[PDB]
Ligand binder design. Structure first.
Ligand SMILES: [Cl-]
Length: 371
């Protein structure tokens, strides 16, 4: 049993959902059909060190479903604040509930991730494949336990989506489900604007830095060194005073705009030159283990797969999505790639990408369907 405890958080109405959708075109074109009941859950999963840890997330259940209810597991993007995660259901979370739950009618399952929400680990293991995958799978299983306890019948339809860091989480979750849980059917998978490829992503974020690049890299290397100690210490990685500022900024209680204002726009300024150059040149002594963590685009998909993003992305390289697409196509014809724009950026494109995800899942909902 993974489910440890839960708390009812009240309802999320059609009317509240409609207001949220209207704020984020093109999602305003979705029709709302349901009110949802919300639960915050806590569940058992493994830490980066392979110990038991109790993590949190949100489950949202359409009330009075007209059809049999499929599950969508939605993996959120980068969060620097402990409490800005789905189990808190703040207004920024509403669009996910509105689109997937109130409109699409899916039981919507949203992990917080380790180091966030109620989890006692002090720091999120950021873009770390092993635990993003296991924490998301264990959340799904715990959510299914909740539905069983509440006599909420669900179908066997299962959809996996996410954005940004969560696009990566979605891909690694998919891989691990296929490997470790081969008898659990997955219906469709649609990672949104994910980072693909260690070299591709490092080059883009370090040398073509968009507005959040320094923050992403600070989070990534601070978290990786914290959990894995691949380098001698933080001062090998980070130039002063960022070696001590970054740990403060990443405490879970700094607003993301404050983090972005405290860090330079050019990520090279936060690193020792030796270190950053070694990463870029793949001459860092840890390059092989870094590639193992990052590179998850060479496995056989066991469900229809849509890689959806924006060619306008300045946060993660669209070239990485193109590379991943060709890699996955070696294994399956049921693989597609879609750009929602030539110029919308990572943030602007988000509601367009969400709309594509919902539409993709609906395509696979309405075939191969049996009670
Ligand atoms: Cl690589």
């Amino acid at each position: 049993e993974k489910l440890v405890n839960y708390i009812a958080l009240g309802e999320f109405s059609r009317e509240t959902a409609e207001i949220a959708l209207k704020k984020m075109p093109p999602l305003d074109t979705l029709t709302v059909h349901y009110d949802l009941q919300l639960y915050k859950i806590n569940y058992k999963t493994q830490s980066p060190d392979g110990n038991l840890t109790i993590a949190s997330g949100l489950v949202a259940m359409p009330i009075h479903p007209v059809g049999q209810v499929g599950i969508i597991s939605y993996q959120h993007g980068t969060r620097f604040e402990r409490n800005d995660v789905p189990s808190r259901n703040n207004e920024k979370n509403y669009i996910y509930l509105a689109a997937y739950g109130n409109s699409a009618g899916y039981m919507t399952v949203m992990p917080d991730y380790l180091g966030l929400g109620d989890n006692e680990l002090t720091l999120h293991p950021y873009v770390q494949a092993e635990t993003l995958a296991s924490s998301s799978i264990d959340m799904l299983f715990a959510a299914k336990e909740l539905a069983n306890r509440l006599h909420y019948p669900i179908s066997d339809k299962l959809y996996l989506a996410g954005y940004s860091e969560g696009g990566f989480s979605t891909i690694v979750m998919f891989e691990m489900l296929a490997k470790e849980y081969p008898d659990l059917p997955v219906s469709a998978v649609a990672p949104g604007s994910a980072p693909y490829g260690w070299e591709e992503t490092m080059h883009f974020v370090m040398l073509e830095p968009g507005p959040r690049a320094t923050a992403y890299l600070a989070y990534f290397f601070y978290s990786l060194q914290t959990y894995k100690s691949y380098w001698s210490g933080f001062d090998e990685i980070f130039a002063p005073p960022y070696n001590t500022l970054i740990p403060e900024l990443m405490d879970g209680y700094h607003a993301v705009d404050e983090i972005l204002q405290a860090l330079p726009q050019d990520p090279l300024l936060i690193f020792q030159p030796k270190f950053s150059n070694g990463i870029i040149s793949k001459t860092d002594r840890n390059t092989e283990i870094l590639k193992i963590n990052f590179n998850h685009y060479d496995f056989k998909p066991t469900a229809p797969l849509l890689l959806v993003g924006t060619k306008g992305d300045r946060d993660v390289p669209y070239a990485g999505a193109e590379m991943a697409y060709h890699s996955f196509r070696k294994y399956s014809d049921f693989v597609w790639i879609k750009s929602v724009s030539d110029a919308l950026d990572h943030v602007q494109a988000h509601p367009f990408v969400l709309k594509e995800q919902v539409d993709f899942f609906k395509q696979f909902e309405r075939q191969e369907a049996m009670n």
